[PDB]
Design an enzyme around this catalytic site. Structure first.
Site, PDB file in Angstrom:
ATOM      1  CD  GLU A 139       3.360  13.861   2.760  1.00 53.53           C
ATOM      2  OE1 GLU A 139       3.863  12.988   2.051  1.00 53.53           O
ATOM      3  OE2 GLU A 139       3.482  13.910   4.010  1.00 53.53           O
ATOM      4  CG  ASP A 169       7.781  14.885   3.567  1.00 53.63           C
ATOM      5  OD1 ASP A 169       8.163  15.586   4.516  1.00 53.63           O
ATOM      6  OD2 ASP A 169       6.863  14.051   3.657  1.00 53.63           O
ATOM      7  CE  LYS A 207       1.885   8.364  -2.702  1.00 47.40           C
ATOM      8  NZ  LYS A 207       1.905   7.177  -1.813  1.00 47.40           N
ATOM      9  CG  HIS A 238       3.317   8.066  10.598  1.00 45.90           C
ATOM     10  ND1 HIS A 238       2.370   8.697   9.798  1.00 45.90           N
ATOM     11  CD2 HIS A 238       4.385   7.834   9.803  1.00 45.90           C
ATOM     12  CE1 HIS A 238       2.854   8.853   8.583  1.00 45.90           C
ATOM     13  NE2 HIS A 238       4.091   8.340   8.561  1.00 45.90           N
ATOM     14  CG  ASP A 277       8.725   6.993  -0.824  1.00 49.37           C
ATOM     15  OD1 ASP A 277       8.428   8.113  -1.232  1.00 49.37           O
ATOM     16  OD2 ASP A 277       7.923   6.239  -0.266  1.00 49.37           O
ATOM     17  CD  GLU A 336       7.001  12.141  -0.023  1.00 49.81           C
ATOM     18  OE1 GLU A 336       7.126  10.972  -0.431  1.00 49.81           O
ATOM     19  OE2 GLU A 336       6.602  12.431   1.122  1.00 49.81           O
ATOM     20  CG  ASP A 341       8.375  10.247   3.550  1.00 53.23           C
ATOM     21  OD1 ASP A 341       8.809   9.086   3.631  1.00 53.23           O
ATOM     22  OD2 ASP A 341       7.173  10.524   3.542  1.00 53.23           O
ATOM     23  CG  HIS A 360       3.902  12.455  -2.658  1.00 50.72           C
ATOM     24  ND1 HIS A 360       3.272  12.661  -1.455  1.00 50.72           N
ATOM     25  CD2 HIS A 360       4.532  11.258  -2.564  1.00 50.72           C
ATOM     26  CE1 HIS A 360       3.515  11.628  -0.663  1.00 50.72           C
ATOM     27  NE2 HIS A 360       4.290  10.765  -1.312  1.00 50.72           N
ATOM     28  CG  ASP A 391       5.369   7.006  -2.920  1.00 49.16           C
ATOM     29  OD1 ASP A 391       6.187   7.907  -3.170  1.00 49.16           O
ATOM     30  OD2 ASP A 391       4.931   6.759  -1.776  1.00 49.16           O
ATOM     31  CG  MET A 441       6.331  17.222  10.532  1.00 48.69           C
ATOM     32  SD  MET A 441       5.846  15.470  10.388  1.00 48.69           S
ATOM     33  CE  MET A 441       6.868  14.951   9.006  1.00 48.69           C
ATOM     34  CG  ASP A 449       6.083   5.711  12.491  1.00 49.20           C
ATOM     35  OD1 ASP A 449       5.428   4.857  11.910  1.00 49.20           O
ATOM     36  OD2 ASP A 449       6.361   6.808  12.012  1.00 49.20           O
TER      37      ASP A 449
HETATM   38 MN   LIG Z   1       5.792  12.188   3.082  1.00 44.10          MN
HETATM   39 MN   LIG Z   2       5.759   8.910  -0.607  1.00 44.06          MN
END
Ligand SMILES: [Mn+2]
Ligand SMILES: [Mn+2]
Ligand SMILES: [Mn+2]
Ligand SMILES: [Mn+2]
Ligand SMILES: [Mn+2]
Ligand SMILES: [Mn+2]
Ligand SMILES: [Mn+2]
Ligand SMILES: [Mn+2]
Lengths: 386, 386, 386, 386
Positions: free
Chosen positions: A180, A244, A182, A53, A256, A216, A286, A219, A254, A87, A56
């Site tokens: 993406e 992802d 979700k 991002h 992860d 993802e 991710d 997701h 979520d 990406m 980040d």
């Molecule tokens: Mn993701």
């Molecule tokens: Mn996630």
């Protein structure tokens, strides 16, 4: 030994192993990571690349002078390690200004800002050699029915993606978008909640060829959907521009988890489908190393993502190459599934008495599908028990 | 009094109030209904119409001679009551021959039969004046990963729908298809599990204009999705050709409660969206009177579907017409949501300093969305408490 | 006007109207609230009382000197407003030291600290006149199977609660414990995930009479369970020492919507059960004003909790007092449900031929339960449509 | 070769390999199995025993004369094969008379019949040497809130179980009850929905020592709960009298996949817990061979249940016996979890300054739990990848 190499195309987001462990009920359990330390640590573990991002890499509200320093330091670490950046994405969720969304904020000035922030980061993404730009509309939705007219929001969503496609074609940039999906979190419901919703929306954009999906694992599993099935539909449509990889224990927040954790059987069938379709994009993780772990646990977690992919791959290949599995696939008529129903046309179908009048429904009904023997062979291969 | 009339366009499936109460753990609690008795009973309650599966009207493996009798008897009851037939569908799920699907059975001869059965019923549908033909691929999917290659299955799905579109255009029939998504049951996962997946698939058909979606309240809620949001996406795409109204208590088996039962708040927002978009299609109930009930309970359940629609409608209208709600919609900037983000183009956006450089993010962030006051006004109107 | 008076026993935690809006993907959208201000504002809205975590009132790592300043200021606000403090709780989830739990941390010294932190706050709770101490084991559990032996963890859980019961009986304190179940978040799975698990565990404590449950609407609905059913079991067992009221849209992350929002029907049946059982405890709201809102939205959200309780209360009473409903309750044999099955004893049951050999199963089977007419009457009353 | 011997105590109900494949949307795909044949076939596959509902063995409404013919034939097959019958159960769900329940039917005469049906089968169960009688209250609950007062229903539930315990102690029978929780299906919500609810209810019975739980993998996973955690609580309470093994893909309808299918990780941790606790009860499979299969698929499915148990058992043992895992268990302080928190007593805890004032919270907070390295070792062992 299932050590990863630079050709396996394994990538990680700076916010994946950099996650500080803040959750809805808890403070940070780890200090922030220098993006340069993450690039070096990931190279050591056999990663091919990192993603980011804007926020980040460049702390929010950085001067253009500071912005450069952060980018030049990052650039140096990539050149030293030979780590790629395939990406990039925009953070349109963290800052309070996005509390009602970016592209579909009710406030028109916020929508305009969201676009200016994204375009700025598309320039950076291309300078760092990224071929895929991801949009995760994490704040696009509502907790309550009156707060968001979904038709107006989809108009604003379309307007935003078309403006971005226009920018990219006017700059002659060699970069594609991946939306993406979700279903919920951090919003009560998110717009384009699944792979299906996102594929359907793309078909209404001015330049649909510039856009695909970044599904993802976690997701789709948060809505209780079969991630392999969704990936198969994305491939059938030629729209799997990115992926992802992570873990999730069914319908809840979520999580992860590292790839292979959560739904191990789905992870097996996922790798079997990616490998057999020859997906050539990066294998992007991710995930969030749980907040129970220190930095040793963070790097073990990252290494596990790649290990579990390689172990699953080997078992899926063995599965597909095994003559007993191939015989079992014919017994279950997977070969008949791959044959056109009526390549003889509709007239021949309407005329064929074996297809209706003289069809022996009871004889067809009595044929076992033999799916259980096939599935036990898949189980035996996954477990290495043959 | 919220009595239903013939203009409200309320319809019911012969298998809705005709459900005998057989479930996975229990035998029938009610005898079978004569389709003619259902037509008469529904007319008395103020229904406009009925829908049917081929097998609800014509017992499976009927002679052409018997087939006619069943149709002529049904025709008579419709003429006597003035009840319409706006929608028909094929049963490609009950008979054991469909245990692995109709259009995507691994067995090619079953796929061919599925198509011949559907085409036969399209002829009948048109003779009875139906303008919508529904496909519910209830057996299209798998319990296990190796049993179904989803890309081959989607090819067979496409082949089937294209052949049907070809038949309809060659006969010059005035009938459109509506695909009905469902995430699971009776299969472990069903193909085109949601409204999104079905919209995306339609965009790949030879003649996409002939196909839309028939979303069901309960089906989207079984995947934990916002049914109003999915309906909004189907409308935005111009693809809401039909709708199935019922109730569901979140993520579990397909309950098919009477409309208004289950998620009452979602039912409110659904009716508010259908009415305000001016959806002109039938208000079709696909519900099961619970197996605890006798025929009095069946007709009370059916009457409740229509009552609950009319009560919700009145409260949604009051909500939208209330000046305090209109002021609250402006306070939450629903009007700004409906305004183009950048009708001044991309060049003007890139040049506008108020959209990035001189954007006061902190001042925008501090603006409350006032969504809670708006939602309490919606609650007060739904409950009739102002 | 559905105004809230002191007799309503409405309560709110400092952490409810003081939630700053930080979530896993976003920063704070509101500044912190001074606990004194919250006491004064909640009194204005017609609250009877407030609750607190130690850490909401006394910043973590406060000197005993600062500790007394915050308590004395709080005390003053309570005296000024006449606001009660019926319930207090420990924060054993926020600080990183609790990343693996409080009472069931793998680290023995963390378990010891957790107990010392709790005991310190029990002293304060009693000084402020609280009759209920809540334990929410939010960090008690795991993301992975090897990390937590659940039998050892339940031994440590038991040890902790017994030590606390010992402390309370030694001090002669007039205070009972309420265990608050939650299935997941922030842990992958939490120990004592439901009302049932928590009731069963209590029965193994040295002094079971000192412990009950504090069930939360949203927590049971995150496991897809019927909150009214769980509350009825807690009442049947005489273990409903406290309750947390909020809203939740089925199986996903813990939303903490204002009471009435989410599952409105379950909110109706909940209030119907609390009122008709004569539950005398506080009506405590544990909710989060969504992060989209400013302070006006915060206070509107809090006011909505109480408003929605009072509307539901009025509609449930009307429901129960309606002669047509009482006749419908007899038609559905709710009165027969309230009669002993065999007050004539096992021998008379074994001897009664009407109970087996002379039982007309088909005549019993044919009797409609008329549950649909009863449920439409409940719907009509809830909506104010008679 | 992971062959099943008599020492494995593998059991299967008549209703498992005899499920005809009727589901809510489809007819039977297989003819009925003669119970004798099933006994003979399950002996061939290495089963130790079978279980039955009264109605699986003796068709409903059998004469006492026919009743004895079916029992004598069954008896003969058991004698011939040496197959045991460790568990029996009543069918209180199939017949329409039970549409509102058995023990908690609103109709008092239905409750009385339910008890007489159960008692008759307890006599048979004991004659055939069963030590466990299972109660699955599959029809105990509601689709709507007004239909069932849950406090009255739990009184009737209690009355029924106490009457049965009275019968059993009067006859001096050597048989214990196992209550089988399920959250929903076929009722909208079922009473005692989880292991926790059933454990808590047992503690209110006249003779609690005669009652435990029969938890089913799929049933706990339909509420999204951790089946290993629930099993650990049942063991901790000394209440695991029986277990039902199968597979389930998260929150949806009751799938009854063969054991190992669905959540493979949870199956691993389940077997690890059963083996390491030394559970001595039968390993009972309650599963349905999918309706896609013929009789070869049925027997493959049954054989897979046992195979998958024996593979998991081997991998769990290897996991626990591996010195690197034992070191990793110490690194994660599973040994500290097994130590009393304060065996020095409350006074020593209150006096210990290392427990509060002298506790270095930041030093404790910084300690990684190393749960990820432990979990990757569990993954490596499960997959046979070391
Ligand atoms: Mn993701
Ligand atoms: Mn996630
Ligand atoms: Mn349905
Ligand atoms: Mn339908
Ligand atoms: Mn909560
Ligand atoms: Mn709470
Ligand atoms: Mn089951
Ligand atoms: Mn079972």
């Amino acid at each position: 030994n299932y050590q990863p190499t630079p050709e396996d195309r394994f990538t990680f987001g700076l916010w994946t192993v950099g996650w500080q462990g803040r959750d809805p009920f808890g403070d940070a359990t780890r200090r922030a990571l220098d993006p340069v330390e993450s690039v070096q640590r990931l190279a050591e573990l056999g990663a091919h690349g990192v993603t980011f991002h804007d926020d980040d890499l460049i702390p929010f509200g950085s001067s253009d002078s500071e912005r450069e320093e952060h980018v030049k330091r990052f650039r140096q670490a990539l050149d030293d390690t030979g780590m790629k950046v395939p990406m990039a994405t925009t953070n349109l969720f963290t800052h309070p200004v996005f509390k009602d969304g970016g592209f579909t904020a009710n406030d028109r000035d916020v929508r305009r800002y969201a676009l200016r922030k994204t375009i700025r980061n598309i320039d950076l993404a291309v300078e760092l050699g990224a071929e895929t730009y991801v949009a995760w509309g994490g704040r696009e939705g509502a907790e309550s029915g009156g707060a968001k007219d979904v038709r107006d929001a989809l108009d604003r969503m379309k307007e935003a993606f078309d403006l971005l496609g226009e920018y990219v074609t006017w700059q002659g940039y060699d970069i594609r978008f991946a939306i993406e999906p979700k279903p919920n979190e951090p919003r009560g419901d998110i717009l384009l909640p699944t792979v299906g919703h996102a594929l359907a929306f793309i078909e209404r954009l001015e330049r649909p060829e510039l856009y695909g999906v970044n599904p993802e694992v976690g997701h789709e599993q948060m809505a209780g959907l079969n991630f392999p099935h969704g990936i198969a539909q994305a491939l059938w449509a030629g729209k799997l521009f990115h992926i992802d990889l992570n873990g999730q224990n069914g319908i809840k927040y979520d999580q992860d988890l590292r790839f292979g954790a959560g739904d191990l059987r789905a992870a097996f069938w996922l790798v079997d489908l990616l490998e057999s379709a020859g997906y050539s994009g990066p294998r992007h993780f991710d995930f969030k190393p749980p907040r129970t772990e220190d930095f040793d646990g963070v790097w073990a977690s990252a290494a596990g993502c790649m290990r579990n992919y390689l172990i699953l791959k080997e078992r899926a290949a063995a599965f597909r190459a095994d003559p007993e599995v191939q015989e079992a696939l014919r017994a279950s008529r997977l070969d008949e599934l791959a044959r056109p129903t009526a390549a003889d046309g509709l007239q021949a179908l309407l005329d064929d008495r074996s297809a209706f009048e003289e069809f022996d429904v009871d004889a067809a009904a009595a044929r076992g599908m033999a799916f259980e023997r096939l599935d036990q062979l898949a189980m035996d291969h996954l477990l290495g028990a043959r």
